[PDB]
């Protein structure tokens with residue numbers, strides 16, 4: 001079993017991912033670390049604790065992270081995407097399970113130091129906790145096995161505005177710290193995940209399936225689906241976070257390109273992710289020079305990824 | 317005959333374009349306006365005057381433009397792409413023809429005001445003179461028939477650094493003024509022009525042809541081709557400026573997408589061009605909201621464009 005920490009802002013697609021992850025036999029979830037984005041950090045913690053209970057694992061530690069980005073200020077949340085409670089307005093009763101005392105940043109540092117080169121991190125929201133752990137401990141990047149990030153828009157439009165994807169826009173400084181940390185990083189941009197969908201028919205197939213969490217997953221996805229229709233004009237949902245989980249277990253369902261990634265932190269392009277492919281010899285040095293390259297998902301085998309996601313969601 | 321002003325920084329591909337333009341029948345070149353970029357403004361004026369003489373038209377007015385970008389400061393020139401003299405180190409004797417007294421900005425306003433909705437502008441370098449014209453006369457944008465711009469990198473890597481294309485990076489503030497002016501604008505990015513090449517074999521075919529300027533064009537192209545081999549790893553040249561001239565006469569050899577274009581003026585992404593395609597309904601307003609969209613070249617019919625360029629370059 002491969003040790004995994006999920007850094008997340010649940011979140012409708014985050015919740016689908018977490019529930020899938022608990023059903024994956026090759027994976028050992030050693031903890032959930034929470035962040036803002038789809039909902040405030042407190043709302044993310046509440047949902048993560050509820051997901052642990054729903055999965056029959058209330059013993060799995062939940063470590064609350066940062067309430068704001070590194071630059072500060074109360075963050076704007078995607079409630080128009082994920083609902084007021086972050087899970088499509090189900091307004092569920094409060095969990096009995098409680099979060100651990102330590103912060104998400106401290107939990108990440110402790111578990112990575114406890115098991116060097118063994119713990120993988122799946123980043124599903126803004127990268128604040130991951131950046132805090134990199135800054136607080138300089139050996140973190142050498143001790144973490146792999147960091148799989150759902151974030152960015154590589155040579156494609158963003159989803160917050162034309163320039164930026166939501167997770168990166170949520171904390172641009174944190175994303176730039178993570179992408180230049182020298183750790184073994186895999187980034188999956190929305191240029192990849194918007195190709196991997198569940199249509200209205202696929203969602204109905206989920207409702208009618210014998211899946212353990214089928215009824216709950218369908219109720220959540222109703223609000224998520226309606227946003228895609230109003231904004232993207234698509235009758236269904238984009239599987240952003242489940243696709244990044246698929247890259248953890250089955251990287252062979254994708255192709256990757258190596259290259260230095262930088263994040264714009266100011267101006268009209270705040271949150272924009274840009275990769276230097278290294279196929280052109282520049283005349284002079286630039287902000288992409290001297291850093292260690294990372295892996296950027298380039299193509300996706302959509303039927304294989306959809307088959308893997310559907311089998312986990314529809315498992316009894 | 318359609319009236320045309322060429323705003324240019326000659327420049328090797330600029331020189332190919334200017335010489336093609338003088339041979340093109342459905343066009344009347346009413347003037348050349350010069351700018352920095354490939355070489356300093358004074359060097360661009362010298363080359364433009366030499367091109368008018370070589371074409372047998374020393375009477376065609378040459379109006380010298382801005383020596384530095386809108387924000388000020390001595391500009392960095394692409395002498396590693398176009399040579400010390402701006403024309404591949406041919407070190408030709410000085411022209412006998414002299415430039416006009418008025419600035420490029422004043423010439424642009426005067427000729428567009430003289431013939432409202434008749435004069436087209438082909439922009440081959442940084443957009444400083446065009447922006448100065450828009451700022452000095454706020455009706456300029458509405459009076460120019462069309463502005464065809466060679467510039468930007470749309471959902472592709474830049475050629476200065478991963479973020480920016482050279483002409484836009486030369487004056488980001490000027491490009492942003494032009495793209496938001498409300499004028500009838502057609503932008504041709506390097507995402508289009510890098511698909512339209514002359515290989516080493518094609519250049520040899522040009523040398524062996526009966527073309528009026530074949531010998532001169534080939535000598536000048538030697539330094540230009542060499543940069544492509546050292547930097548891009550391509551044995552030949554990218555026809556950037558001749559392709560934008562092809563978009564003036566034959567826009568039917570391309571497909572275009574309508575959308576608001578903004579330019580980043582600060583940070584690591586200074587000079588980055590980004591278009592909002594308008595295919596997604598945004599939840600809130602952004603820097604792309606409220607402006608008039610422009611036409612962005614999306615695809616190119618490479619054989620048709622190559623055929624048109626080759627027939628002009630190889631005409632006796």
Ligand SMILES: O=c1[nH]cnc2c([C@@H]3N[C@H](CO)[C@@H](O)[C@H]3O)c[nH]c12
Nearest residue numbers: 011013078081124150159166167240
């Ligand atoms: O349209 C959207 N706007 C903002 N955030 C999201 C999300 C969330 N943010 C990430 C994708 O931007 C992903 O992790 C998901 O949990 C999905 N769709 C949208």
Ligand SMILES: O=c1[nH]cnc2c([C@@H]3N[C@H](CO)[C@@H](O)[C@H]3O)c[nH]c12
Nearest residue numbers: 327329394397440466475482483556
């Ligand atoms: O590789 C390059 N770096 C900088 N400028 C140029 C140019 C010039 N600048 C424009 C394309 O960036 C184009 O108008 C041309 O005259 C060609 N190739 C390069």
Ligand SMILES: [Ca+2]
Nearest residue numbers: 011014124125
């Ligand atoms: Ca998420």
Ligand SMILES: [Ca+2]
Nearest residue numbers: 327330440441
């Ligand atoms: Ca030029």
